[PDB]
Structures are given as C-alpha cells and as structure tokens.
Amino acid sequence: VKRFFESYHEVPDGTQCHRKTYITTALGGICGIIGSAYSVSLNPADSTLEAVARVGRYTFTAAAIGAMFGLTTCVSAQVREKPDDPLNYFIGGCAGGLTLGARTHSYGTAAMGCVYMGTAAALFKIGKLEGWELFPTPKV
Amino acid sequence: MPSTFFNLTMAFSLSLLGTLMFRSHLMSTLLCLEGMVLSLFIMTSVTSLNSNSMSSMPIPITILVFAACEAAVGLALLVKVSNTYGTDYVQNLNLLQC
Amino acid sequence: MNPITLAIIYFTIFLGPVITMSSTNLMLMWVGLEFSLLAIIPMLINKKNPRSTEAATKYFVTQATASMIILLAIVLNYKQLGTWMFQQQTNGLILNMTLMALSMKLGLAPFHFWLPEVTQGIPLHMGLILLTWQKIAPLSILIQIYPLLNSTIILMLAITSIFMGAWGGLNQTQMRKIMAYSSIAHMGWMLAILPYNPSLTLLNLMIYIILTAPMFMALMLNNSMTINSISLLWNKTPAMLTMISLMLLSLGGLPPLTGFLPKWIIITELMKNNCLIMATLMAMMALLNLFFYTRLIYSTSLTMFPTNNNSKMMTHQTKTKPNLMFSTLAIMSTMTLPLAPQLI
Amino acid sequence: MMNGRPGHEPLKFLPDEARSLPPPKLNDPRLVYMGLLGYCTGLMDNMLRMRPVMRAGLHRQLLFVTSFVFAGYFYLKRQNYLYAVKDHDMFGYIKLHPEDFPEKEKKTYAEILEPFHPVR
Amino acid sequence: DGPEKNYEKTLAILQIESEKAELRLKEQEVRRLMRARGDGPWYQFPTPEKEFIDHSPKATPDN
Amino acid sequence: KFYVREPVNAKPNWLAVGLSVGASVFMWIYLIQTHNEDVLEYKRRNGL
Amino acid sequence: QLLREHWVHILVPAGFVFGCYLDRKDDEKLTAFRNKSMLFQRELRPNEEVTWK
Amino acid sequence: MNNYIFVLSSLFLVGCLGLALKPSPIYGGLGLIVSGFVGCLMVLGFGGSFLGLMVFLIYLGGMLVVFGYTTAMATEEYPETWGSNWLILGFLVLGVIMEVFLICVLNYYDEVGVINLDGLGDWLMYEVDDVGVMLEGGIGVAAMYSCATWMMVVAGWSLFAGIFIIIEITR
Amino acid sequence: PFLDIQKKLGISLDRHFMFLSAEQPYKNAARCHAFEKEWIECAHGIGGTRAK
Amino acid sequence: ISAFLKNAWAKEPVLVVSFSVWGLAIIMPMISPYTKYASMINKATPYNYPVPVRDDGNMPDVPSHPQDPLGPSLDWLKNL
Amino acid sequence: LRYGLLAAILGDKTTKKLHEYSRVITVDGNICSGKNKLAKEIAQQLGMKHYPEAGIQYSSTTTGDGRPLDIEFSGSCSLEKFYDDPKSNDGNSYRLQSWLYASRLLQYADALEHLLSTGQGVVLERSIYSDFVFLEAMYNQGYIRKQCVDHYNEIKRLTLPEYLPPHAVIYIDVPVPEVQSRIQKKGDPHEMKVTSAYLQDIENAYKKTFLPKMSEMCEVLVYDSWEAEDPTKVVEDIEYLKYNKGPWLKQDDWTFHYLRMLVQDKTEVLNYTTIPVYLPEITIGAHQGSRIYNSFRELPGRKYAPGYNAEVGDKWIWLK
C-alpha cells in the first residue's frame, strides 16, 4: 500500500540505503509522472510518439533526481556518524539539484536547484525532527 | 438495489469522462451532459422508490426541469457558435488565448 | 436588452445566490447555482462577437460540468443518509467531490484556466459581476459544511491557487486577465482558512469585493483594458491616480492599507492552528502580486507614458461617469485598517 | 463559532441582551475616525468629479459625514455586544470546567534556578 | 509632574497588558476544548430539526 | 452666460439639497435620542 | 478682514493643545495604582485628595 | 426474472458508454434514446410509473430537437459511427470487457458488498404497503401543488426565465 | 442555511421535507421512519460534534 | 374601449375567447357557492384506516360505535 | 434627469418623435464645390439643422466658452502649414487628418444626438464616411506613410461601425480644372498651393470608393454644378426621395435608446480615437503633454466642471 513510503522512517537515517533509495526513486518517479501528465495535457505533443518520449524523459529525470537524493543522504549519514542532522539532507538535496542540472545541461539550473532543493530537504528533515505537520487538521 | 446503484454510478462516471475528454464536437459534449443528467435522475428515482419517501419525489422532476433549461441554453450557444464559425468544432473557440 | 428582459434577467441573477444562501435543502442550493449559471450567460454573450460567444461557451461548459458533479455528490449523500443535507457521517469521498466541484465553479487552481479567458472575453461590468457576485453562492455552501471539509485537500488547492495566481499575473498586459488572476489569488487565501475559521473567509471576501468593485469601476471610467491604455490616465483623468495607486497597493497587501488585514488575520489563525509551513509559503508567494501591482503603479501614477494628440479633444469634453459609490468604496478599502478590531 | 450559541436569534442585528451594555460614547475615537473617513469620501468625490474640493456640495459632505457616523455608531454597538458575548461564554465555560483550567503555582525566583549565560 | 506619576502609570500599563496576555492565552485553550469536545456554547454544529417530524398515526401500524 | 451649452449643473437640485439637509438633521436628532435612551436603559438595567 | 489668509496659523497650535488634552485623558485612564505602589505609598496629606492627579 | 434489473443496468451502462465515446451526434442521440428507454424500464421495475414514463417522454422530445439541431449544424460530410473509427470501436469493446471483468473482480473481493451476483434480485423491493391504496409515485410528484409548492415555484420561474434567456442569446 | 431567513420569518419553504421521518402524503410512513426519528431526536439539543 | 374590443373580436376572435376563458376560470371559483364542497369531499374520502382512540372518560364527543349519532356526518354529501 | 433607461421607460422615445424630414443629409464634393451654400439652403428650406463642416476648432467652439483655443490645445496642426509643406517632417499632415476625423466623429455624434432627441433632421457637409478621401489623396501624393494609413483605418474600423449612416448623400461633381479655377478666384494664399494631382486623387476616391459604397445603404444624389446652383431643385429631389434601404429600417425604440446612450456621452464617442498606438506623428510625449494639459486646465472656465467655475460667473457652488 502507501505504507511503503512511510517505511522510510523505520531504521534511523544512514541505514538501509538500498531501501531508502528505492523509496525516494519511487517518489521522484511519481512526481515526474504527474508532471509529464500535465505537460502532455496542456501543451500537447505534436505526435503520440513524441508525447510518450516526453513522458519518458520527465519520469526518468525525476526518478534519477530522487534516487540521487536518497543515496547521497544515506551515504553522507553513514560516512559521518551523524544519523539525525539536517546537513545530510542538505547535501542530498544539493546532489539532486546537481542531477537535475546535469540532465538538463545547464550550470545555472544546476546551482539554483542545488541550493533550493538542499534548503527544502533540510527543512523537511527539521520538520520531521521538530514535529511540524504539513496540513494540520483544525484544532483551534 | 446495490448492484443497480453501482451500475448507475459507473454510468454517470462514464458520462462525466465523455464530457471531460472532448472530441471536436460541442453537440457531443452537450449529449454527454444530458447522459449525466439522465443517470442522476434514475439514481434519485430509484432511491426515492426504494425508501418509500414519497415527499422527495418532487426533486427528480425539478432535476429534469433545470437540466432541460440548461440544455436549451447550451443549444442556443451552439447556434451562436455555428453562426460565428460555420461548424460546432471546439478548435475554433480559442481566440481568448491572448 | 429591453426593460422587461433586463428586469427578468437581473432578478434571476440576484435570486440565484439568494436562494442558495437561504436554502436548507441541498437540491435548492443546486437550484440557485443553476439559476445563476443560466441567467448570467445572456449578459456574457450580450455584445455578440466571436470572443463573447467563446467566453460564454467556455463558461457554460465548465459550470455545467461542475454543477453535475455537485448534484452527484448531493444524490449520493441522499442515498447514503436518507437526507438532503451533509451530516457528520457523510462520506469523505462525497465531501471531497463536492469540494472539488465547488472549487471548479469558483475558479481555484488547478481548476482555474477557464477564469482568465472568460474574464478577458466579456465587458468590464460583466467581469465585475462575475468576479464579485457570482462567488457568493459557491462559497456559502462550503461555509455551511466547514466542519466536514478536508484540510489537506483545501490547503493543496489554496497553495496551488496562490502560486498560480501570483505567477499568472506577472505575464499579463491585459487588465481583465490581471483582475482574474488577482481573483484566483484572493480566492486561494479565502479557501485557506475555510476549515478553520469561515468568519475570516467572509472577511476576506468582503475586503476583496470592496477593493475589486472600485478597480473595475475605475477601469470602466475610460475602458482601460490594457496597461498602455491605463497609462494615459494622467492625461485623461488625473484625479483618479491617487486612489488607483492606493487600491492596487491594498490589493497587494501592504500593511498600512486595509487589504493587509485579511492576510494578517489569516496568518494569525493558521499559526494558531499550527499551519506554519503553509502560512509561510502563502505569505511569501503573495509578494509576486505586489510586484505586478507595483508595475501597474509605475505605468499609471509614478511616471508619465506618452500620450496622443487626440486626447486633447478628450480633455475638452465633460464627464459624469464616476458614481458616489467609487469614493465610498475606495476610501473604505484603503483607509480602514485603524478600525481592524471591528471588522473581525 | 458563536452561531450555535444557546438563545441565538437568526438575523438579529442587536439582540435585547445588548441593551445591558454601556452605549458607545458619541465622541468615541472610532466614531470620530468614521466621521473623518466620511469627510474624506466627500472630498475625494469632489476631486473625482472635478469640483472645488473643499467648497462644492457642502450638503453632500454633511450627508456623508453624518451617515458614516450613524452607521459607525450602530455597528460599533453591535460589535461591543459581540465581544461581551464572547467574554461571557469564555468565562462561563471556565467556571463550568474547573478541572481543565487549574490554578497556577508560581515558585519565587528565590527557589527558581535559571541558567546563567555569560556574555564574554 | 514627578517620578511618581510615571512609575505608577507604568504599573497600571503593565497590569493591563499582563491581564490581556493571560486572557489571550486562556481564549485559545477554551476554544481548543470547545472545538474538540462540543460541550460549549461555541462550535455547536447543526443537526436535523426535530420540529418537522410527523408524529401523527400513519397508514401502517409499525412506524 | 459663459457656456455655449448651458452647464448640466447650472442651478442646485433644490429637491436634492433639501432632502440631504433634512436627512442629515434627522440622522443626528435620531442618533442623539437613541444615545440618550440607550444610556437610560443601561443605567436602569444595571441599577445606576 | 484679513482672516482668510491668516486663519491657517491656528491648525498646528490647535493640534498641540489637543494633543496635550489627549495626553491628560490618557493619564486619567491609568489612574489605578495611584497611591498603591510599594514605592511612593505615603498617606494623603491633609486636604489632599490625589497624589499626582 | 432475478437478473432483470441487473441486465437493465448493464444495458444502461453500455448505452452511456456508447454515448460517452461520442460518435456523430445522430448516433449519440440514438444511444441516449435507448438509455432513456432502459432507465424508464428500471424506474418501472423499482415500482415507479409516472417518473419512468415522464423521463422517457422528456428525452424523446429533447432528442427530437437535438436531431434537428445536429442535422442543421453539427453535421459532417462523413458522420462518424461507432465502427467508423477503429480506435473508438476498440475502446468500446474494451469498455464492455472492463465492465464484465470489474464485475467479477468485485464479486470475488466481496460477494455481498458492492455487488452480489449470488441472490441477485433478492434485494430489489425492500418493504411495501400490501393493503395500501394511495402509494404510486404520481401522488408524490403531485405533492408539488400543495405540500412542496416552493419546488414548483422555482421550477416554473426557471422555465419562465428560460424563454427570455434563449431569446436574448439567439438574438 | 447560510442566512436564516426562513427561521427569521417563521416560514418553511423547504425545511419540512429534509428527511424520511418528515411528513409524507396520505400518511404513508417512509422506510426506517422510526429509526430516523430516534436518531434525530437523540441528536437534537446536543451539538453535531457530540451527536457523533 | 368597446370599439377596440370589438375590432379584436372581429379580426382575432381566438385570442378574445382565450382571454375570456382565462378571466372566467379565475372568477368562477370565487363566485360559485359550491367551491366549499370541493375540499370537503376530498377530506371525506377515507384512504387510510381511522385508528381508534383509547377511551378515558374525557371523550364525550367522539363516538364509540360507527353507527352512533355523534361524530361527523356525510348527509350533506348524500344530498348535495 | 439625464436620458437613461428610466427616461426611456417614462417616455422620450425616438420613434415617436421621428417624422418625414427626420433624416440625415450629407453634402459632399471636392474642394470649393458649393457645399456650404447647398447645405445652408437645404437646411433652411426643409427645416433641418445646418451643421457647418467640422474643422480644427469644432470641439473648442462646441465646448466651454465657445471661443477658439490655441492650436496647442486644439490639435497642434495647421491647414496652412499642410498646404505650404505637405511633406513636412513633424507629421503635420497626418496629425491634421486624424484631428479632423476625430472632430468629424464628434460632430456626427452631436448631429445624431440632436436628431434622436428632437426628431429634427440634420444637414452635414462631409462626414466620417467621406473623410477618408483626403487621407487617400495624402497617401497617394506621398504626404503620409503606410503606418499612418493603417492607424487611420484601425481607428475608423473601431469607431465608424457603431453609428447609423446618413439617410441621403448629395455629391456635387465639379471637375479638377474648375476646382482649381475656383480656388484661384477665392484667392487663399495658402490654399492656392494645392497641386492638381491632389484634387484628382480626392475626386478619384470620391468616385471609386465613396459613391459605390454609400449607394449600398443610403440614397445617393449626384449633381453637376449647374444643378447644385438653384438649391431648390435639390430640395425638390430630397422631398420626394423614398428611403427603402440601409440600416435605418431595422431600428426600433430599444435600438435608438442604446445608440442615443452611446452618442450622448462624448467621452465614450472619442474613446477609441485615443488608442495607445505609438505612431510618432501623433505621440506627444510626457513633458509637452503635461505642460499643455496644465496650461489648458488654467484657462478660464476650464479649471473645474462647467457648473463650478466661480471665475466665469458660476454661482451657488457651495450647494451644488
């Protein structure tokens, strides 16, 4: 089910690389699938083969970004013992941004993606640690 | 009752899909809207008859009244589109992109 | 239109939302929605040009599909609970379908694409009606079921609306499209606080209307449907520049003006409910709107674009268009922050 | 939140309970600001219609000021009633549920040990 | 006027603002409890109206 | 005497002027009476 | 007379006097603790009604 | 006679699928006429009468007008049927197959929940007044002249303003 | 009702056929009339949060 | 305007008759003396069983048997 | 009570006022053809109102004091400069032509308002329908550019289709040599510089584009000079003209109402002449524009609204 995704937080970060990398690759692939769906819907391709090619490009790029993010985060948290430190997620986000920039063949996109994705991943780690909740229910 | 209502829900979903995915004719989309209305009317009628809720039998007829008014307005718009362009192809209706 | 038709269509336009707001039966709320949808189309297609017909057809198809989805939700709830009203035990998918269909009717992103085009295709007064009066009926139903709505769905819609309105307004040289994207952004803000405090949704609606109606009236004063067209205000009607600047800045949300209070109070309530990330993202992305309003202010009030020779004949004539309502609404929309506690 | 309050009366601007509260003093700062806003509205209307800003339509300006003050007075009375009702409900709920609002026991700074952070 | 005036005006200001602070804190807890439990004047969500139930004898016995 | 087309606002709309002045006077009189009555009711309810 | 040009020289002084009046009113509103602070807690001298008005 | 209503529902679903696939509006209107007939039959089976006959009558008239309008405006030199486009034909057969497949899949995942092929027809009419007299849906619909006159008022006003609306639109 | 005009006026345009347990033509009790009556009467008075 | 009404009768009798029948349909129910019985008969028609009430001694006007003198009488309908 | 839906409901209907001589009659012809005399006589004999040909100062004469204003306020164009240096470099040619078209549009609005409000017909010399002949002659002679022609065509497309055409058009045909001789006889030191090619272009436009087009919708009457003299004959032709053509037949009270509402707001009439098309010949520039606008608003009887200028004798301001 969807608990496959929530399995990401079982073992402390820095362990079960392969598994966390699989999870993040799945997340990236899903995001790329949705983005390709919207791009094909609005802004239609000239041919069905071209549309399928664009879907493949988007999905592969997003999956690669997610896989790199997960692998780099785990490898950092393992090489340095820090098992729950946002800098690991910042490094992973920068690696994902660099992957995006490389796949797009753009140094500016590489750098901006590194910075933005690293900040986003660090904030996600901080939120998981400190107990923030995206989409809180009305408590008042 | 249960299987009938499941089939009616799926029929409405099919009509909604036919509405959402266009196919170069405005009349066909209007017909899909009519099909959605028909499915909803059947669902309401079946529910009222099964519940013996006689006081709720007015509502199915009001559904038809308002659906018919909407269909008439849609047909008037189709007349205007045909006057403007010569056909009811939705490809022409794209002047507002800019 | 002749007087009988004008009366009979304006009464229907006014009655639709009144019936929805006063009805206890979901079917009669839907009837009010249908009244609005049917009665507004002739006024959209009144002028009869290809753009008017295209806008009317787009509006009709979108709104009819949304109404059918809403009726599906109503009928399924009737089947489930034997009642014509959503209860605490109504199914989550039924409520989600209702929310999505009503957001499609309103124009919240990603169900927003139709709105800027339909706004572009119609005269300015019709755009005013569409962006102000027609929002009340869909929002009333949501405000009636605010304890039942899904916070995740509503917040996704709200943040998407904020982002898409902010980014759309940047690329537009057309005043009607800019108004439509401003509508999308403010509706995102309105929907963000619906699950938590619908009184603030009503407050944001009221302030948005009190700001938008004067903006459309000022646009209608000279039929300024473009940035270049509005730039000639310093020559055609200089006196309105100060109020236009202040109204635009209030729409943007600069503190001292009244338009700040909705964003401020909504952020306060979201934070009270522990919605820090979404509140921060919304307040951060609501600055693109200030940017593309300040661009308008530069073009209209803080500089002087080139003018035409013929505008001297314009200057010669006498004008009588601005009602007594423009001054009242503009002052109320700009200079009312000190009375903030009364508004909430 | 207060729309389901017991004794709530639909579409009632000023319930009878509101008569017990003290009326807004008629030279209140808020009412004076509302009058000032009405005056500014008259001035802006003149400026928009191209009339002597401060000299034209004194009858119109008087009507603006008086109408603004009138509406402000009655609306402020309603708002005072609403705030009084809110405080009434809050204190009543606190009285009803003492176990949820226990009293506090503030130790003195003599017995409190706050950490010291040198500024070296 | 003298230092007493400013001193004992600051005392009054501090009292008022501290009381306002404690009330602002209490209102949030009160609202949280009322919303969570539903036993207060606020957040009383509507239910079907029993005034419009038909209690007269029906056509069939078992109703 | 000056304008070729006699100005649309050559003379005051005396009906409008009278009605506006009367409405302002009535609004003020009613406001003062309402304030006095409200104060009296408040004191009577609270026992002075 | 020459009032139409010189009357404008009463606004700012009027603003200052009105500000002094408003300050006195704000002083009145904070009358609590007038003689009730741990410091400055003397008993009223004969024929004295308030410590600092 | 235990599969009667299920067969009617399957026919209605197939008709709505044919309508959704959007052939030429002529065949779309024919499919909608068949669907309206089957819906009338289902309403009749559930004890209705006035409602089924009325829906059939209304849709007969509506599809007549739609036929006139489509021949006058939504026409093409080679109107498209269901078999004309092989993609449409393939998705039609796929829809039939995916209905016959989902029916079995649901019947397997649970045999009593959403669908119950076993005892199909056992749970059609729940409770009925055996010795009653005034029970037909005509009475419920006619309640609009006394008990629920507001519904009549809104419907009548909608139809009244429809004339002005269409006149203005077509002007 | 977002606006309680019907309660304000005392009129009932559409409040008298909101559920099965309401009034039916010729006193033909609906299906589950007793159960809906019991549920509505139990839930009356207390809020919609409590009644859940 | 008897002349105009007349010209209408001469050239467009159908509309004159339509409006005359409209007016007569509106008026006759008010004038007629039998309009009271139209609803009395509908009330008289018994479509549902008349459920008996439990006797308690405080019921002197409601009969005890179908053929008792007390209760509503339908002789007004018997000779209408 | 300004005209509006309320006034139309309470009365003030155009069809009620229209009579036999509630027409629009437009006199046309090359330069110096007798248009002025012919129009004056037609108007005097038929009871209609004469509208002298709109000029550079029509708007100033029709608004405010009624006096002509400085050319900086009235268009920064000069007919004398046009004739002296037709191929200028400040675009006086096209500035003059666009200003004259705008003035003619304003005058046509005034004439239509008069006709619809009172029912009395109007006799106009030339109109927005025949204005384009001068522009075409300018372009053919090289006095303006294709961009100027496109801008003029765009403004005409935006403005002209909103008004009804004249009922009758009366074209006085006089050949180019006689036009030239009449110009010399008049002896205008600047007008005499007009080349014969320009006049021939005007005649070519009149006879190729105007008359065939106007024949579609109006009643056209072509006269030679010897018939244009003795205007009684032209009036006798008009008095028996039968109008069974054009858009005037399909109008009704609730079309005249909206035409009147459009034509009653002079600001809305000229709205589209000021579209922000940045043609150098017409673009002013912020500094000069603000200078001229302030100088204009400092003119007597122009600082405030018409009823609110105490300097020009307006009274009761404090109660208006």
Curated annotation (Swiss-Prot), chain B:
It is found in: Mitochondrion inner membrane. One of its GO terms (molecular function) is NADH dehydrogenase (ubiquinone) activity. It catalyses: a ubiquinone + NADH + 5 H(+)(in) = a ubiquinol + NAD(+) + 4 H(+)(out). Its EC number is 7.1.1.2. Gene3D superfamilies: 1.10.287.3510. GO terms for cellular component: mitochondrial inner membrane; mitochondrion; respiratory chain complex I. The keyword Lipid metabolism does not apply. It is a multi-pass membrane protein. The chain crosses the membrane at residues 2-22, 26-46, 58-79. PANTHER family: NADH-UBIQUINONE OXIDOREDUCTASE CHAIN 4L (PTHR11434:SF0), NADH-UBIQUINONE OXIDOREDUCTASE SUBUNIT ND4L (PTHR11434). This is NADH-ubiquinone oxidoreductase chain 4L. The lineage of its organism: Eukaryota, Metazoa, Chordata, Craniata, Vertebrata. The gene is Mtnd4l.
Curated annotation (Swiss-Prot), chain E:
Belongs to the complex I NDUFB5 subunit family. Accessory subunit of the mitochondrial membrane respiratory chain NADH dehydrogenase (Complex I), that is believed not to be involved in catalysis. Complex I functions in the transfer of electrons from NADH to the respiratory chain. The immediate electron acceptor for the enzyme is believed to be ubiquinone. Complex I is composed of 45 different subunits. This is NADH dehydrogenase [ubiquinone] 1 beta subcomplex subunit 5, mitochondrial. It comes from Mus musculus (Mouse). It is found in: Mitochondrion inner membrane. The chain holds residues 127 to 189 of 189 of the full protein. It comes from the Eukaryota.
UniProtKB/Swiss-Prot annotation, chain J:
The chain crosses the membrane at residues 15-35. It is a single-pass membrane protein. GO terms for biological process: aerobic respiration; proton motive force-driven mitochondrial ATP synthesis. GO terms for cellular component: mitochondrial inner membrane; mitochondrion; respiratory chain complex I. The keyword Zinc does not apply. Keywords: Acetylation, Electron transport, Membrane, Mitochondrion, Mitochondrion inner membrane, Respiratory chain, Transmembrane, Transmembrane helix, Transport. It is found in: Mitochondrion inner membrane. It comes from the Eukaryota. InterPro entries: NDUFA3. Residues 55-80 are annotated as: Disordered. Complex I is composed of 45 different subunits. Belongs to the complex I NDUFA3 subunit family. Accessory subunit of the mitochondrial membrane respiratory chain NADH dehydrogenase (Complex I), that is believed not to be involved in catalysis. Complex I functions in the transfer of electrons from NADH to the respiratory chain. The immediate electron acceptor for the enzyme is believed to be ubiquinone. This is NADH dehydrogenase [ubiquinone] 1 alpha subcomplex subunit 3. The lineage of its organism: Eukaryota, Metazoa, Chordata, Craniata, Vertebrata. The gene is Ndufa3.
Swiss-Prot record, chain K:
It is found in: Mitochondrion matrix. Its cofactor is FAD. GO terms for molecular function: NADH dehydrogenase (ubiquinone) activity. Keywords: Acetylation, Electron transport, FAD, Flavoprotein, Mitochondrion, Phosphoprotein, Respiratory chain, Transit peptide, Transport. It comes from the Eukaryota. Pfam families: dNK. GO terms for biological process: aerobic respiration; mitochondrial electron transport, NADH to ubiquinone; proton motive force-driven mitochondrial ATP synthesis. Binds 1 FAD per subunit. Phosphorylation at Ser-215 by PINK1 is required for the binding and/or reduction of the complex I substrate ubiquinone. The modification N6-succinyllysine is found at residues 87, 250. InterPro entries: Deoxyribonucleoside_kinase, DNK_dom, NDUFA10, P-loop_NTPase. Gene3D superfamilies: P-loop containing nucleotide triphosphate hydrolases (3.40.50.300). The modification N6-acetyllysine is found at residue 87. GO terms for cellular component: mitochondrial inner membrane; mitochondrial matrix; mitochondrion; myelin sheath; respiratory chain complex I. The modification Phosphoserine is found at residue 215. Belongs to the complex I NDUFA10 subunit family. Complex I is composed of 45 different subunits. This a component of the hydrophobic protein fraction. Accessory subunit of the mitochondrial membrane respiratory chain NADH dehydrogenase (Complex I), that is believed not to be involved in catalysis. Complex I functions in the transfer of electrons from NADH to the respiratory chain. The immediate electron acceptor for the enzyme is believed to be ubiquinone. It comes from Mus musculus (Mouse).
